[PDB]
Write a protein that binds this DNA or RNA. Structure first.
Length: 290
DNA sequence: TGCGACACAAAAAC
DNA sequence: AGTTTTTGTGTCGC
């Protein structure tokens, strides 16, 4: 009834079928590592402004809630939350040096203002985009919002246990404990060590995330989870790393900038999950029906 | 047909 | 140790 896999950090992922077993909402058994991501492709090259060195990049993503590995399929539930976290790494650049440097996109052409992640959901069979929604912990008693683009600096991805522990922290002392894991506070650095053109100082806000954490995420309530043949639709979650550049023939989205202008989120790399099955609200998807 | 809205309840958080 | 918070899901109805 429960299949157990050991995670990288020594925690377990316990996969079970909610059609057969009902577990409490806050049980640690609800936390588990989801399907592994794979490279879709690399897009625009990035180089350091003076040396011309190509910046090697790698997205480091993981799902920590919402998906079970059941009989060779990865299964989620329309009504339930998933958690998707990601960082990125720069193999050839240590963080301290990276933040003092400046980078251009090779279309030295366009100056990178900052790096950022976005997530998307798609129908894996035809590439149609599917809307995602997020809630706050207050759920129906708070606002609903779409996942946003997250400015980020390179960092190792926290272990599954750390994401679990930081999922519902309110206590100030505890939050202080995790602060350095999740944020870089630009306002606390020695400004004299940085040039005006440094990458750190073109980030849009002083509080800069080290990890993109998308919690309390759901597929849009109106998604159809079966095909007309009654077969299950296959979905996929995508993570895209981009460089945000000033608007003033390569893949990019438009971004409602901070200068109040129309920025450009230029794609650098994209990863995706294998096909995912999403179970709808039908009573037959729940153990209660048995 | 299935969904928005409200309800219940169980373990985490403090 | 007791109270509040969070979230899977049961249920009513439009």
């Amino acid at each position: 009834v429960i299949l157990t896999q050991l995670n990288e950090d020594g925690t377990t992922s316990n996969y079970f079928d909610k059609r057969k077993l009902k577990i409490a909402p806050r049980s640690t058994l609800q936390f588990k590592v989801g399907p592994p991501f794979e490279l879709v492709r690399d897009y625009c090259p990035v180089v350091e402004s003076h040396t011309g060195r190509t910046l090697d990049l790698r997205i480091i993503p993981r799902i920590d809630r919402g998906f079970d590995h059941i009989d060779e399929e990865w299964v989620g539930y329309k009504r339930n939350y998933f958690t998707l976290v990601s960082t990125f790494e720069t193999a050839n650049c240590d963080l301290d040096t990276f933040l003092k440097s400046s980078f251009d996109l090779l279309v030295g052409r366009l100056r990178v203002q900052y790096f950022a992640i976005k997530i998307k959901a798609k129908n894996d069979d035809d590439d149609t985009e599917i809307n995602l929604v997020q809630h706050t912990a207050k759920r129906d008693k708070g606002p609903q919002f779409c996942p946003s683009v997250c400015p980020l600096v390179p960092s190792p991805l926290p272990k599954h246990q750390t994401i679990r522990e930081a999922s519902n922290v309110r206590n100030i002392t505890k939050m202080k404990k995790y602060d350095s894991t999740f944020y870089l506070h630009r306002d606390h650095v020695n400004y004299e060590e940085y040039g005006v053109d440094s990458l750190l100082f073109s980030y849009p806000e002083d509080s800069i995330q080290k990890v993109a954490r998308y919690e309390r995420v759901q597929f849009a309530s109106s998604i159809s989870v079966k095909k007309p043949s009654q077969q299950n639709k296959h979905f996929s979650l995508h993570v895209i790393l981009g460089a945000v550049v000033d608007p003033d023939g390569i893949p990019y989205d438009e971004l409602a900038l901070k200068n109040g202008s129309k920025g450009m989120f230029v794609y650098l790399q994209e990863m995706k999950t294998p096909p995912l099955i999403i179970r709808g609200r039908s009573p037959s998807n729940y153990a209660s029906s048995q």
